[PDB]
Homo-oligomer: 265 residues x 2
Amino acid sequence: KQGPTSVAYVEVNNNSMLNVGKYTLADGGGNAFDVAVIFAANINYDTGTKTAYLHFNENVQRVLDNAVTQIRPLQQQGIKVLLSVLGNHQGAGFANFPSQQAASAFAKQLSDAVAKYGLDGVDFDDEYAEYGNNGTAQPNDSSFVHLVTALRANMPDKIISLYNIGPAASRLSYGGVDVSDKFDYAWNPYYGTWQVPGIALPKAQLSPAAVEIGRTSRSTVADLARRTVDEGYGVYLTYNLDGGDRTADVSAFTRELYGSEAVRT
Amino acid sequence: KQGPTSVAYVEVNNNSMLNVGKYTLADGGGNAFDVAVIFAANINYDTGTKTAYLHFNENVQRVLDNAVTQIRPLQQQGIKVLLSVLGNHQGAGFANFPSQQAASAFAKQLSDAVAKYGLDGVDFDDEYAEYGNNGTAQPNDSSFVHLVTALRANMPDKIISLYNIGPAASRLSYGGVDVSDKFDYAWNPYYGTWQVPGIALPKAQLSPAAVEIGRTSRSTVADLARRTVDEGYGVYLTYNLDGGDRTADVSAFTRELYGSEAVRT
């Protein structure tokens, strides 16, 4: 198995994390997917105390509580498992924590969950935060820097990634500190398109291609996988693998990334 | 019961539409809520044929199929029931239909569902469409105008509303036709804030206030309800009523809108 790291996002409200493990390379026998992401936990906002807090809906909680059966098998098979976090429409986002302390306390919340559930990392998706809702503040220039810096420190050995989207994505440097090097991956959030993330990570850690399995055309899936290889990028983001027979969709990119079609079990 | 029309959005993936009916005015005995919205159906995109189509997840389908038990009781009690539609991250939105025909065919899809399930109208939420995803086109100036014009015609007697947000919201006039007068309501999409929609509807048809039940502070819920009355607006948007005991949250706005506290049954 030689080739770009492929990622699979799974919407746990509707599908099992286990499906990520059913796809292997017909030739290699290796995993078709290298990283699986639990989509997604939330950053809620308590209007009473004006504080953000981490929240798991019952579906996310359910998979976490069943790590032995929902996550362990993936990890034993070699697949890393991250927990994605996104701001709801409550007004709290990754770019509007009022201070290092506010930012640091939430970082601690993320670490304690990773440690507790034995996850391999955290993924940031500043997509629907809706800054200003419920009296929250608009983005500032230090919130994200404080957040990431604190998170990297709490867990120096785990993966921290981010979708290249939203306010937070463009606020990577505050004062004289740039947190770009603190991330392990960055991916294009626009499915079915090619868009090189503007963040300073080496090509091996970037995913300009993004596809939605079962939605984006197979021809487009294959062209973006080929383009990833041609241009020398080392990551290929995939989104929304469900429980149906997606073998053709998967093969569309494994042929290009690893010169092998895929097989479902 | 005299006062602004209050609206309740219910996320059917997690809660019953029926809860909207459990709240009545302690004094009046009238409904605490006048309009209930099923949140939400989707506008999907078929990349094979490059056409948008209406999609109901199993939860939305489940409530529609059970109209006799999930919707009828609300309507018999006097509550109107709308179906909200939103563009996924598939690339198809209300502002990017390639022609009157494309726009008209989807309008027909919405009408046939309203007619089939005996709904009282459609609500447009151009919030997460992600124009350009999967090869779709960016917004244009006629898509929405064609869409609404066609929809109003198919169902001249039903409610058509929209959240004041996204590309579509600002593309209300194409050529010499303005569709603002074709809408019955327009609401602020930003929870916990006051923001008068910029669309040309009379105050009686506008909701500058928007709150999320159980999230936005009760004091803010009460202040925005009072402000609605002070300034003479006739609608008050509420979002995400669940199955818990939200009596205090509800009363926070009924006291202001109708001079009565609410009661749950």
